[PDB]
């Protein structure tokens, strides 16, 4: 009865979607901008060879396995490769990571929307004939306005009405296509959204390629994107940057991967058609999104100014800078509501993929019908976003626990359940049976001793040199959040000791 993929172009584009997202077009410009450009490239580039590639097979891999038994989340799927209470808790993971980024993501998706629509409308702020600030201010304050940052002392945010509204109606977005289900709504949107963000993107571009001012053209910030600096290579930091990146962008610890893999048939390849989802991601975010924004900024600004935009970050970059540099030339409010309607369809497929594990839990193990299923789903992810909403820096502590220490951690934690306890011969032949191609003989060491080895380390160092400095100095509010989401972590492990009860009086009931 679990639904399937219908075509392998829609898994394809589904799997494309889920991670071809916000991370593309705004995270990854900044992390690049902020740690040296192309001083950033080398370490990004081997953290996709070294740690991209390889989960992303084990995911699919995890996930199909799971699904021929009709399980699609972590804390069955774990208890599958590992008969151990502890594995349904670490599994528990596999919920909470994808909520938590859902409950901050979602909302951010659907300021892109509200941009559109006010930039599509022509309500937008006009800046006077050179002087920078007399023309970022006025978006800035837009923004500011928008989503109402902090004009006091108090840590509080005040969203417009229009704010609100939005994220209602993304919510409602959501939601129309993930209760259609997986063939009818998750992959035919997916055959519609990909290709119009597609195009949408190359004209950007193009766009952005023809920007040229008495500081530079886009082709001096294409430069600095692309020019390594070997010397940065010992740098701890941008390690960090570079392989944190690479798990938000392809989605890589949050448990989605897997589950839309559990749609996939028992015998449908993965080998091929994981490394193309993660190909395409790979190019949507190195050529589109990096040949955006960062060119752009250099262009009118010059490479200084542009990386200090970026360090300054606060979604500076996308939501001031770009509209900001688009309202200098003709058709310039059309050009801003182009690239908060593709933001918008980047955060949408990406969206409805981080809340379908949720989903998948509660239809595969408390039985919810979908429509059910998707009601609650998006109730929990709408009451819980009022706490990013309405308290200033809770969506960065919750990005920073879950879509960057979490998704680490969680990788590093499936790669050793899946190749070190259920077996790395057991775990090779299962990713590759039905591969249209097979796994090179190398990444089986790569996945068995390197892959761990390299992000144990990473957290080693992390743990040591960098969360210190942050679990002791933040604003007291920061435990707002970190109460709120560790509750959220105990009301999953509360349900999943539900379908545990569930499952044995049925179990009993069988015999
Ligand atoms: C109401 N639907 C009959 C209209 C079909 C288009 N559609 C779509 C396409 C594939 C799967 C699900 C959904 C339903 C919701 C939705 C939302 C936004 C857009 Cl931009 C299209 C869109
Ligand atoms: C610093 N915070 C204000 C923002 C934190 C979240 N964020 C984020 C999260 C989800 C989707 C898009 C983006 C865009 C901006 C961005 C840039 C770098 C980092 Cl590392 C996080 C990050
Ligand atoms: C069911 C959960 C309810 C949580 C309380 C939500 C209160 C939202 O309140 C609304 O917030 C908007 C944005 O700031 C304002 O524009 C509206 O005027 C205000 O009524
Ligand atoms: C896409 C549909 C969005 C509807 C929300 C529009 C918010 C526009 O703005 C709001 O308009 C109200 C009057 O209508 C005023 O009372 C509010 O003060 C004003 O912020
Ligand atoms: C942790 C999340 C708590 C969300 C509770 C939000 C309660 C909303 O509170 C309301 O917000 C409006 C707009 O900001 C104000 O105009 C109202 O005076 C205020 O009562
Ligand atoms: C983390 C929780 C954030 C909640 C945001 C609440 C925003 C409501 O706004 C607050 O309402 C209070 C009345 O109760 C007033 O005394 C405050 O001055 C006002 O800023
Ligand atoms: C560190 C990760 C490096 C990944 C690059 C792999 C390039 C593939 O390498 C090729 O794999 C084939 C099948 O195993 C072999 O038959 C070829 O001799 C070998 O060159
Ligand atoms: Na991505
Ligand atoms: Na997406």
Do not use: C
Not at 36 to 49: D, K
Not at 128 to 146: A, C, G, N, V, W
Not at 369 to 385: D, E, M, N, P, Q
């Amino acid at each position: 009865k679990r639904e399937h993929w219908a075509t392998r172009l829609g898994l394809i584009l589904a799997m494309a979607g889920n991670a071809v997202g916000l991370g593309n077009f705004l995270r990854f410009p900044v992390q690049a901008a902020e740690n040296g450009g192309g001083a950033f490239m080398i370490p990004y580039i081997i953290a996709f060879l070294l740690v991209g590639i390889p989960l992303m097979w084990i995911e699919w891999a995890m996930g199909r396995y799971g699904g021929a038994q009709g399980h699609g989340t972590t804390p069955a799927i774990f208890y599958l490769l590992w008969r151990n209470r502890f594995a349904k808790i670490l599994g528990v993971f596999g919920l909470w990571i994808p909520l938590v980024v859902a409950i901050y993501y979602v909302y951010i998706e659907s300021w892109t929307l509200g941009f559109a629509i006010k930039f599509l409308v022509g309500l937008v702020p006009e800046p006077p004939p050179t002087d920078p600030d007399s023309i970022l201010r006025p978006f800035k304050e837009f923004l500011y306005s928008y989503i109402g940052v902090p004009k006091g002392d108090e840590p509080i945010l005040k969203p417009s009405l229009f704010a609100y509204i939005v994220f209602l109606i993304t919510m409602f977005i959501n939601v129309s296509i993930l209760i259609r289900g997986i063939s009818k709504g998750i992959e035919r949107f997916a055959k519609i959204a990909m290709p119009t963000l597609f195009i949408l993107a190359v004209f950007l571009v193009i766009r952005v390629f023809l920007l040229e001012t008495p500081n530079g053209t886009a082709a001096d910030g294409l430069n600095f994107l692309w020019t390594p600096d070997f010397e940065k290579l010992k740098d701890p930091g941008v390690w960090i940057a570079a392989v944190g990146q690479i798990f938000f962008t392809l989605s890589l610890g949050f448990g989605a991967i897997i589950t839309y893999a559990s749609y996939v048939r028992k015998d449908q390849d993965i080998v091929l058609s994981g490394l193309t989802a993660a190909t395409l991601n790979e190019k949507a975010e190195v050529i589109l999104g990096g040949s955006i924004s960062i060119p752009a900024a250099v262009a009118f600004f010059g490479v200084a100014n542009a990386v200090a935009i970026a360090k300054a970050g606060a979604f500076n970059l996308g939501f001031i800078t770009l509209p900001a540099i688009f309202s200098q030339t003709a058709g310039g409010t059309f050009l801003g509501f182009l690239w908060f309607f593709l933001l918008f369809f980047a955060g949408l497929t990406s969206s409805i993929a981080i809340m379908q594990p949720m989903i998948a839990f509660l239809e595969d193990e408390l039985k919810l019908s979908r429509k059910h299923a998707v009601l609650w789903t998006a109730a929990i992810v709408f009451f819980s976003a009022h706490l990013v909403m309405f308290l200033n820096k809770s969506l960065d502590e919750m990005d920073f626990w879950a879509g960057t220490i979490g998704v680490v951690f969680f990788g590093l934690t499936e790669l050793i359940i899946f190749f070190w306890i259920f077996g790395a011969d057991k775990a090779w032949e299962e990713i590759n049976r039905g591969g249209i191609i097979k796994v090179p003989r190398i990444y089986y060491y790569v996945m068995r001793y390197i892959t761990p080895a390299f992000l144990a380390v990473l957290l080693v160092v992390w743990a040591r040199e960098y969360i210190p400095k942050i679990m002791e100095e933040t604003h007291w509010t920061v435990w707002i959040t970190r109460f709120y989401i560790i509750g959220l972590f105990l009301f999953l492990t509360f349900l999943v000791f539900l379908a545990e009860r569930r499952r044995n009086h049925e179990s009993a009931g069988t015999l």
